[PDB]
Structure 1
Amino acid sequence: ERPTFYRQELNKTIWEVPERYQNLSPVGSGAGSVCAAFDTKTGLRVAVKKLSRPFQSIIHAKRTYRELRLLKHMKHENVIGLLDVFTPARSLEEFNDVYLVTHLMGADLNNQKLTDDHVQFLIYQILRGLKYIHSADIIHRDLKPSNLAVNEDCELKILDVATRWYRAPEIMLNWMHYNQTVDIWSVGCIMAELLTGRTLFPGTDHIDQLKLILRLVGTPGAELLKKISSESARNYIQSLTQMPKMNFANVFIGANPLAVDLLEKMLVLDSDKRITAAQALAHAYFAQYHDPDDEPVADPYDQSSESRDLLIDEWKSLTYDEVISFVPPPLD
Structure 2
Amino acid sequence: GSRARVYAEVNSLRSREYWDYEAHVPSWGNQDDYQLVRKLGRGKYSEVFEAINITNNERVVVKILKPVKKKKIKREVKILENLRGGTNIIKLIDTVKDPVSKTPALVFEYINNTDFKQLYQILTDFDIRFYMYELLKALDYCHSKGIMHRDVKPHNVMIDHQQKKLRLIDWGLAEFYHPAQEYNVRVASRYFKGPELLVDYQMYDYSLDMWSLGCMLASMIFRREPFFHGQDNYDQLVRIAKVLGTEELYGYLKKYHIDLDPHFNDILGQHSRKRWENFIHSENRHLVSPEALDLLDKLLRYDHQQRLTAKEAMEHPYFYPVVKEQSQP
Q: TM-score, normalised by structure 2?
A: 0.70
Q: How do 1:21-36 residues align onto structure 2 when only pairs under 5 Å count?
A: 21=34, 23-27=35-39, 28-29=41-42, 31-36=45-50
1: CA distance between counterparts of 2:48 and 2:260? 45
SS in 2 for 1:290: helix
**1:159-212 deviation line (CA, Å, top 9, x unaligned):** 11x841111111112211112111111111111111121121111222221111
In the other structure, the counterpart of 2:116 is 109
What is the Cα deviation at residue 235 of structure 1?
A: 12
Instruction: Name the CA shift for 1:153/1:233 in 2 (closer, same or farther; >3 Å).
Output: same
> Superposition pairs for residues 204-215 of structure 1, below 5 Å?
204-215=231-242
Q: Which amino acid aligns with 1:114?
A: L
Name the SS for the 2:62 alignment partner.
strand
Q: CA deviation at 1:44?
A: 3.5
Query: Could you report, residue by residue, the CA deviation over 1:125-145 in whole angstroms, capped at 9, with x for unpaired residues?
Result: 111100011112211111111
How far residue 87 of structure 1 moved from its aligned partner, in angstroms, is 5.2
2:320 pairs, out of 284, 287, 292, with 287
Matched, 1:165 2:191: yes
| Match in the other structure for 2:70 | 61
- Point out the structure with the larger helix share: 2
TM-score, normalised relative to structure 1: 0.70
Root-mean-square deviation over aligned CA pairs: 3.3
Q: Is the 8 A contact 1:282 1:290 kept in 2?
A: no
Matching residue of 1:155? 165
Match in the other structure for 2:26? none
Q: What residue ranges of structure 1 are gaps of 5+ in the alignment?
A: 1-14, 54-58, 90-94, 294-332
What are the equivalent positions in structure 2 for 1:15-54 lying under 5 Å apart? 16-17=30-31, 19=33, 21=34, 23-27=35-39, 28-29=41-42, 31-39=45-53, 44-53=58-67
Larger Cα Rg: Structure 1 or Structure 2?
1
How many angstroms apart in 2 are the aligned matches of 1:164 and 1:51? 22
Does structure 2 conserve the Cα–Cα contact (< 8 Å) formed by 1:87 and 1:97?
A: yes
Whether contact under 8 Å (1:228, 1:234) holds in the other structure is no
Q: Does 1:219 align with 2:219?
A: no
In structure 2, the partner of 1:85 is 95
Residue type at the aligned position of 1:187: L
**1:20-46 C-alpha deviation (Å, 9 max, x unpaired):** x4x432415372444322246666420
Residues of 1 paired with 2:310 and 2:203: CA distance? 19
After superposing the two structures, state which structure 1 stretch, 36-45 or 147-156, moved more: 36-45
- Equivalent residue for 1:126? 135
Distance 2:103 2:268 in 1: 54
Identity of aligned residues (%): 32
Partners in 2 of 1:78 and 1:70 — Cα distance?
14
Instruction: Specify every segment of 5 or more residues in structure 2 that has no aligned partner in the other structure, as ranges.
Output: 1-28, 171-187
Structure 1 residues 100 and 214: CA distance shift in structure 2, 3 A: same
In 2, are the aligned partners of 1:78 and 1:158 still within 8 Å (CA)? yes
CA-CA distance at 1:261 after TM superposition: 0.8
Alpha-carbon distance between aligned partners in 2 of 1:97 and 1:143, rounded to the nearest angstrom: 27
CA distance in 1, matches of 2:147, 2:30: 33
